[PDB]
Write a protein that binds this ligand. Structure first.
Ligand SMILES: Nc1ncnc2c1ncn2[C@@H]1O[C@@H]2COP(=O)(O)O[C@H]3[C@@H](O)[C@H](n4cnc5c(N)ncnc54)O[C@@H]3COP(=O)(O)O[C@H]2[C@H]1O
Lengths: 272, 382, 272, 382
């Protein structure tokens, strides 16, 4: 016999939209404009200046070796060249938004989890359930709630890249040697004290690792959401797919890669 | 008297009210476990403590001893009981007062020293005050002072991992002392060090306690580490088997039959490892180096084939050296060498003649050990 | 000024196809038929029997606890119910193919890498470059070479999920304590000897971990390739996306999840 | 003679031909490093070895000693040199012959014992033959035999992690012996054990070498671990500073000025840690337990405030026990107590009167150490 999970889910969705309409709407409004604004700003700057700024930044992080800043300048020249700049800046605003949201919404959760053994049981299952899902589903409720655009994309990205942030957090916090915990507590240190003197300064490594992971996940999720609003090179690669156009697909994907590699080589070197 | 305990105990697992009611009647630990699966670490513990009264706590891994400490500090909340310090219970204190207590009265030392590798020894030392919201001047002052008191200040503004275990132990100890606590909890502190550094630190701790008279919960699984310092010992097997202390009463009037196997209370199994010198290869200078390291005045002499040969003395070696003569000639083959299995009153008339021990040489010339007045002990036990 | 990476890439692609045509063609032929055959087999079986078989298998792995086999039976009943079975079996053949291919093609690479410090330098960059890419690109050369279908999808899945397999391999092999290496060598043990007595039996944990990871990656890549041939619930979720049909999208994705969770809970419990 | 070495050396990093040419002329290591960045571990090493001639190799962490071993076994390919074993070079051997050699002649022991935790002690023992493609019968037979020879067979068909360091060391040693090798390479084997187990294993190894006369490269950073067994020592600071051995020639005629600071070749800094007994708390039984553990016949007596008080003897304690009398009365306050800074030949006559040492009591009553005929040594050094 059949069970109506489709209808249940449909109905639930219907009910929600049909209750939180205004919230979603204003949220949409704010999101898009902000994103539009941000995009307009970046895309106000030239491309040359931006490349040179990133290049210096590379030197700053890595003063001696020559490969990464070299490659960064090269690829950004190339990307500016093919004309995929406005789309690039759309992609970057999308990411930054999704990543910051996922951080701001997960790190406290890693805290609450490392503190309570109940929340761990409640969430770990949710975390695996979300870490195994595909991206494709996440963006259907996105349009269901906000509709087409950037807002839905960053929503999906957040909900897709939160898990590892939260996980690595709770882990880097539950893995501090119990001696130091006991010590901090033996001198009458409130949770805040040890937390901002002992826990973070140590777990920071794993935290930034999970954060890099979260950023990459948000990036892939945006490349996906491109099939719904979500400007950026995702649209170019998508068109190339739906048109079998090898050239532009490879080109959009290579620009995306360059971007992601750069973001990584930056993040890695911000941990210590 | 400083501390006082009353029916204190701690229970792990779940369904702990039933276990509480059980111990309220005398239910053994094993049965409680089988019936509830709530492993107990402490069981109807009642005793007290006085000032300057170093109160060691012995036991085997699993006797739930460190747990008792973490209860005293309340790091682990007691299932029940009371702790009357300064006319002030401790298990019925709010958070503020408990923190102030931990800040003023108590302070811990840990096995692996509980040090923050992401700080400088100075910072780890002053943490106890940092968390008390005090200016940095006096913080650094008291820190430098405590460190000078341990002769390692110059090694400050460094990190732990680049030091030796002993230094890190001294560091944690100074961190605990900075607060001028009236109490010091210690959880197998010196158990991670070398036995030499262990004795050194024991003596340093005794010197400290002489200068500053403050109470100490010590913990250890080594009876010697306790007897050297302990003024009132307390043995522990999931409960206070014996806490009378006195050091000897545990050995004099051991109430239970398990303490006596813990302290190890008729044959000559007392033969001890010997100090050898293979004359066939080594020389006087070498024998002297060995006498120096082993910190003795004489040695036993064997053959390259491990066959017993005799005895050597410091003066004999010095004479062979000055004369440039070798061993195997400047020796004492005349000795009261004995066999492994004999009576405790066997070599009674000779043990006094020979100032040197009486090697227990194997029947076939091989050597096992020696005897230095440890025969007297069990000989008079009759 | 511009540089013609599009044209270069286009030209290269053109040249290859236009050289290895027959290979690609026969490979296609063999792939699809095999896949078709496998699918036909796995669909030949009823659904009820298959569920009961998987259920026993669960009990076999986990005899006492009741949650995982329960849930497996439940979800498979549900999936058989909505009618997503033939598509499911297509998805499973796709995965098994991609996963086995990626294993068979990476494990030797983890070997060669743990043995030679050159190959590590050569490859690690390639591994990061491929672990940061999106899936979308991978399937454009797939059609470029084989065209529409399952073959392209499993190709993409393999090339997308190889990296972590290879990485965890080379790592679990370079992390055995050097004492045991030196010992195996001090008794005159050829590389094969230590390798099949010492290296594997230890690194197996990390190896199976990277393999589970590889399987999940292949799964996501198939869900993606659904936009090109690649039957399975990927098509259902895709349609739901391109149609905003919440019900069917959620339903396909939940069946996919159930499948992935099951595959995980199986893999995890095959390491020791 | 068994082994023979010729201009052997090893260089790390890159650009090693230049470093080779450099050492071919005598370029120091530091300069080679600065000029090429090719750190060297071995430098123009030339020596030989004989049979049954335990050839220890000392040095500090970084002297590149274990490297020399792994070169002898060829685990690390030599940059240059030759190794003439059984009239058969080793650096010019193909793979087959090198493997057969490793299987027949040589066998290693390691610091952390190099054991396969995923096997049973029996399997780890027989591995050396397993890799030689031999039937399981004789494999298990030789294994059980070697284990019985170490008195742990019953502990077989278990795993390492559930054992003690000493047992795992014995296990690796049996694994190496099973092959009946003519050689045994050892890389700080006993450096991971307790010094007590260390001495026990040293003596067991000597007994073995007595039974079976086979060559041994030993390695250690402890000069005593070498002097106890070493028949021809070789000190190492990136090169053979001294290899003559003889045990004493290193101390008798130390050629270089760095060996003499390695072996530690006018004040009374020789005061050694003392054995105390706080009469104010402890009793005769306790003092006897301490005499037993410390393995001595007498003890020093202090006050609860660490103030020196006198001396105790085993017989005095036994008498106080039988009589039930306490300490502080059955003692010897009459003693040749001395101060920290006395002249080289200060208590030159009294040291002989008092059989017991002469405690170096601090000016203020405190105690530091004692003196047992270690004064004679440096007193006659003049
Ligand atoms: N920190 C310390 N280190 C060493 N001794 C300390 C000490 N503090 C106090 N003493 C006492 O001083 C005496 C020094 O004895 P000496 O070393 O001249 O004469 C020693 C030594 O030359 C020799 N000996 C001691 N232990 C030995 C062993 N394990 N193997 C071989 N010979 C040994 O036999 C004599 C036995 O002396 P006994 O035990 O009657 O007496 C020892 C010991 O009881």
């Amino acid at each position: 016999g059949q069970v109506p999970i489709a209808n249940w889910v449909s109905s639930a969705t219907d009910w929600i939209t049909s209750t939180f309409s205004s919230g979603f709407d204003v949220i949409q409004k704010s999101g898009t404009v902000l994103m539009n604004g941000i995009t307009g700003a970046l895309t106000a700057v030239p491309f040359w200046l931006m490349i040179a700024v990133v290049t210096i930044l590379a030197i700053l992080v890595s003063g001696k070796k020559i490969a990464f800043p070299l490659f960064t300048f090269i690829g950004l020249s190339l990307i500016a060249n093919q004309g995929l700049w406005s789309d690039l800046m759309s992609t970057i605003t999308l990411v930054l938004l999704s990543s910051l949201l996922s951080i701001i919404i997960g790190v406290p959760l890693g805290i609450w989890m490392a503190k309570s053994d109940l929340v761990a049981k409640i969430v770990q299952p949710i975390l695996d359930f979300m870490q195994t899902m595909p991206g494709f589903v996440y963006l259907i409720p996105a349009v269901a709630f906000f509709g087409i655009g950037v807002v839905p994309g960053v929503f999906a990205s957040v909900i897709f890249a939160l898990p590892p942030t939260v996980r690595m957090t709770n882990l880097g916090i539950r893995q501090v040697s119990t001696e130091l915990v006991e010590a901090a507590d033996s001198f009458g240190s409130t949770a805040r004290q040890k937390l901002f003197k002992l826990e973070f300064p140590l777990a920071k490594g794993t935290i930034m690792a999970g954060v890099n992971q979260t950023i990459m996940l948000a990036l892939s999720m945006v490349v996906i959401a491109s099939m719904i609003g979500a400007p950026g090179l995702g649209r170019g690669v998508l068109a190339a797919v739906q048109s079998a156009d090898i050239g532009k697909g490879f080109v959009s994907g290579i620009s995306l890669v360059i971007l992601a590699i750069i973001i990584d080589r930056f993040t890695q070197k911000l941990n210590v | 008297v400083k501390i006082k305990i009353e029916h204190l105990t701690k229970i792990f697992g779940k369904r702990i009210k039933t276990a509480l009611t059980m111990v309220e009647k005398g239910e053994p630990k094993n049965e409680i476990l089988k019936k509830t699966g709530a492993t107990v670490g402490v069981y109807d513990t009642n005793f007290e403590i006085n000032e300057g009264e170093i109160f060691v706590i012995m036991g085997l891994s699993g006797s739930g001893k460190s747990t008792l400490l973490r209860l005293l500090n309340r790091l682990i909340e007691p299932t029940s009981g009371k702790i009357f310090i300064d006319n002030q219970d401790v298990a019925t204190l709010n958070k503020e007062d408990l923190l102030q207590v931990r800040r003023k009265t108590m302070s811990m030392v840990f096995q692996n020293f509980g040090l923050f590798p992401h700080r400088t020894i100075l910072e780890n030392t002053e943490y106890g005050l940092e968390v008390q919201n005090v200016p940095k001047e006096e913080r650094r002052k008291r820190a430098e002072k405590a460190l000078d008191n341990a002769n390692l200040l110059d090694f400050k503004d460094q990190y732990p991992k680049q030091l030796s275990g002993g230094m890190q132990q001294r560091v944690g100890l100074a961190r605990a002392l900075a607060n001028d606590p009236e109490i010091l909890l210690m959880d197998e502190a010196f158990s991670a060090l070398d036995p030499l550094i262990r004795r050194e630190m024991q003596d340093e701790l005794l010197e400290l306690q002489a200068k500053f008279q403050k109470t100490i919960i010590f913990v250890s699984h080594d009876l010697n580490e306790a007897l050297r310092i302990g003024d009132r010992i307390a043995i522990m097997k999931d409960g206070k088997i014996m806490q009378i202390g006195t050091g000897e009463e545990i050995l004099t009037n051991p109430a239970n039959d398990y303490v006596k196997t813990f302290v190890e209370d008729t044959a000559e199994n007392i033969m001890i490892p010997a100090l050898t010198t293979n004359i066939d290869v080594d020389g006087p200078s070498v024998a002297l180096k060995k006498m120096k390291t082993e910190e003795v005045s004489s040695l036993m002499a064997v053959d390259k084939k491990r066959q017993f040969r005799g005895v050597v003395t410091s003066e004999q070696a010095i004479a062979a050296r000055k004369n440039n003569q070798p061993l195997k000639d400047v020796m004492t083959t005349d000795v009261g060498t004995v066999s492994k299995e004999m009576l405790v009153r066997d070599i009674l008339p000779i043990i006094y003649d020979a100032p040197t021990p009486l090697a227990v040489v194997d029947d076939n010339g091989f050597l096992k050990g020696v005897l230095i007045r440890g025969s007297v002990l069990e000989a008079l036990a009759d």
